[PDB]
Design a protein around this ligand. Structure first.
Ligand code: HEM
Ligand code: HEM
Ligand SMILES: CNCc1cc(C#N)cc(OCc2ccc3c(C)cc(N)nc3c2)c1
Ligand SMILES: CNCc1cc(C#N)cc(OCc2ccc3c(C)cc(N)nc3c2)c1
Ligand SMILES: C[C@H](O)[C@H](O)[C@H]1CNc2nc(N)[nH]c(=O)c2N1
Ligand SMILES: C[C@H](O)[C@H](O)[C@H]1CNc2nc(N)[nH]c(=O)c2N1
Ligand SMILES: [Zn+2]
Lengths: 407, 411
């Protein structure tokens, strides 16, 4: 029950013990592995609080202290009375950093302890949320010198007063259907783009229309807000070699900020907690441009390269996929916007793994998601065995609000 | 209990019932996933259920379940087990078994072909020379002058585990690897240890960058013996590039026939420890792994240099750029010489069709996403966005320990 993981490129073997602290379930069983599947009261709550507080006071080398037992009793009494409890700032910051630390699918976690936590638990309105989000975006962006951050809105109470950011990301481009049949803008967002228009948004109808924010406070109806353009840093996409690349009329936003997940800490549920870092190149160029259910500009690009698109055997898709990705990195780098390539990030992650096996006894990791979506086997994480398990605090999926929210 | 998988590119959803037939274990638990772990003398006690289950499968497939033929056969195998502590498969059973071991190979992207397998029955074989002969005929048949044909050759099953047939090579055709005094490696780095064993066993190494290794063959638990495959049987393809004329001067070539020989075939409880099988290459198996993996030929740098790439920072993606050209060359070379190869786009598309057809007619298709997704350009192939259930069905191909670690040396 003390598990080894082997890197088959270097024969380096790490032993995992951290997994024995895992609580939540994987979805797998002895007879079936689900590793490639996308998605997975008062009595319940106090063990959850205790587990969290126990790891907190251990991490500050005050396990078993009067401070520890006092805090434990304090929360216990607050629960039995108020049927919930509140985190101290220290615990709030610790929890958020560790939800990222434990995010098994994230290749970026070497940075995990350098996270800026914004406490928005005093927030009461959509307008308020807009202010907090604007401040988040501006701080994180930092004129291209991106900084990781999370903003945390009030915890769930009874599921009727949830704070929700309805956008999947704070910054994303609109996608509109054409009567012609195809898709203008960005196809991933077509339903949300409709919802916004369905909610009173005036669509500029371009390719790169920044979506409005659709914020829900205290469980009320959500509200549209237009992010100040001056806060949305964008990079024009050009190629260092192909001058015709500029002509394609492509750009992307510098700030990846996922806003639809739920942050769980010591049993408490933060349904609104937008968090952001900086892009790995492939997230935009491999997925956001070349996925079939996305921009799918591959064909167009290959044409301009005058590649033989008659047989798949020419690997024209591959060749084009590469140039596109060379351009993304070039464009961001030239504009002094933070970006990391997939070789650098994966090299960092292997180092981070070594650190976590060393100082923590392991590191939950989801190979299916850690391996970049291109050039997989020439990155060091490919030949790296990984163990995937669920630690807490954590980021979780949650239903789309429009499937739930009673209007 | 029914289970669903979703293709997130097409929103196509399929339902798996076949997983209920799963006997063996994944390595996973409710609290841990070992999905990316490479690898996570049997008595009459547990052998007859294993036999019965197989024969139940077999007779279901031929629509004779519960027939007199089915029951008698059960009886015949039963009495044969309790009398001899093992049993023999009929020829029909052996062929069915071998095909379904491939069909059940959750890590194999090429399974659309599983029903077209040429089974060579080598169970009457008794010596290493006899093994050499069977293997030569396999190679000749499978190669078919470049128009490749899937085949497997099956040597006698394990008895007490002291009389194993083994092919000590990991593949029937593979290039030598030589560690040099200065720490550098001549040839395929992946084969150094095996090359050394061979040399020790009396092999005379030509010590070139592309020496075909000799066969090292073990029959009936005896010490293995060295044989040289006749060169006219080993079909090789010089690697050149369609636009880059300097690519030929890298002096690269590869062999045409991928034939894996160190795995164990399990059928109805019986263990076939020597069972070499071959099909044909997916382009990336040579171009990405066999040339560009840092623990292999690793010509990435040289190809990059010759392309005059910016190799200063990784964010130029010179590595990615070279990799594509190398795979372009590999496919180019094979197609030009009319040697069967498939590119990773064609093969993953084929597999998705295979999978869908298997969910409808069989109730599922076990698949290992970690291994099915190609090692370059993953997300622009349709398997990347395809959810997959992994579980172990029998008959199957299994790993087994390297023979030189377990073998008792006679002399
Ligand atoms: C700072 C630079 C960062 C980089 C380069 C990075 C990289 C990545 C990448 C490439 C993915 C794969 C996602 C996909 O392909 O769709 C991912 C997933 C993820 N990231 Fe990071 N990340 C960073 C920061 C952060 C931060 C600050 C957080 C939270 C505080 C975070 C939490 C997550 C989570 C929870 C997932 C997986 C979500 C899921 O289960 O679907 N990341 N990350
Ligand atoms: C005919 C065309 C075939 C193609 C294109 C093909 C392709 C592949 C590829 C690319 C892999 C991954 C290998 C790696 O990355 O190391 C694989 C695995 C595998 N193949 Fe197929 N294969 C073919 C035929 C066959 C045949 C004829 C058999 C057996 C009768 C077979 C059995 C297997 C098995 C058992 C694995 C998994 C090996 C493991 O678990 O380590 N394949 N195949
Ligand atoms: C749709 N794909 C599945 C998917 C679903 C959900 C949900 N619910 C969230 C997803 O976020 C991946 C992610 C999250 C945070 C990131 C940060 C901070 C930085 C970065 N560079 N990349 C990131 C990628 C992905
Ligand atoms: C060390 N690498 C992992 C590895 C270990 C072992 C073991 N033990 C076997 C391996 O075979 C994968 C395989 C097997 C058969 C194949 C056939 C017939 C055709 C083809 N094109 N590719 C194939 C690939 C790979
Ligand atoms: C079907 C498949 O499991 C699913 O599309 C996953 C696979 N791996 C991934 N890996 C990353 N990094 N991001 C993704 O969206 C996905 N998608
Ligand atoms: C650690 C990891 O599981 C291991 O390196 C696997 C990953 N996926 C693979 N996939 C294929 N097709 N072939 C391989 O050799 C591997 N290696
Ligand atoms: Zn699993």
């Amino acid at each position: 029950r003390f598990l080894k993981v082997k890197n088959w490129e270097t024969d380096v073997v790490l032993t995992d013990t951290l997994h024995l602290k895992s609580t939540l379930e994987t979805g797998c069983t002895e007879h079936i592995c689900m590793g490639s599947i996308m998605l997975p009261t008062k009595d319940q709550l106090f063990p959850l609080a205790k587990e969290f507080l126990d790891q907190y006071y251990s991490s500050i080398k005050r396990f078993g202290s009067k401070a520890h037992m006092d805090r434990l009793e304090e929360v216990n009494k607050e629960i039995e009375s108020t049927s919930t409890y509140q985190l101290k700032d220290t615990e709030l910051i610790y929890g958020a950093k560790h939800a990222w630390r434990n995010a098994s699918r994230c290749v970026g976690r070497i940075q995990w302890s350098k996270l800026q936590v914004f406490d928005a638990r005093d927030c009461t309105t959509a307008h308020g949320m807009f202010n907090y989000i604007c401040n988040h975006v501006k701080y994180a962006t930092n004129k291209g010198n991106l900084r990781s951050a999370i903003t945390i809105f009030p915890q769930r109470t009874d599921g009727k007063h949830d704070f929700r950011v309805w956008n999947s990301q704070l910054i994303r481009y609109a996608g509109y259907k054409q009567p012609d049949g195809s898709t203008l803008g960005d196809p991933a967002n077509v339903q949300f783009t409709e919802i916004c228009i369905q909610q009173g948004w005036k669509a500029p109808r371009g390719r790169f229309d920044v979506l409005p924010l659709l914020l829900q406070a205290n469980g009320n109806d959500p509200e549209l807000f237009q992010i100040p353009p001056e806060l949305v840093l964008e990079v024009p996409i050009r190629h260092p070699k192909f001058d015709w690349f500029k002509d394609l009329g492509l750009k992307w936003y510098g700030l990846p900020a996922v806003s639809n997940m739920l942050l769980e800490i010591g049993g408490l549920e933060f349904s609104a907690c937008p968090f952001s870092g900086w892009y790995m190149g492939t997230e935009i160029g491999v997925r956001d441009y070349c996925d079939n259910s996305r921009y799918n500009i591959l064909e167009e690009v290959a044409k301009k390269m005058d590649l033989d698109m008659r047989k798949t055997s020419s690997l024209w898709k591959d060749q084009a996929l590469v140039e596109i990705n060379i351009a993304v990195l070039y464009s961001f780098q030239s504009d002094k916007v933070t970006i990391v390539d997939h070789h650098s990030a994966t090299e960092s992650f292997i180092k981070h793994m070594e650190n976590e096996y060393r100082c923590r006894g392991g590191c939950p990791a989801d190979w299916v998601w850690i391996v970049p979506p291109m050039s997989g086997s020439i990155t060091p994480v490919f030949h790296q065995e990984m163990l995937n398990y669920r630690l807490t605090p954590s980021f979780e999926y949650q239903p789309d609000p429009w499937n739930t929210h009673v209007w």
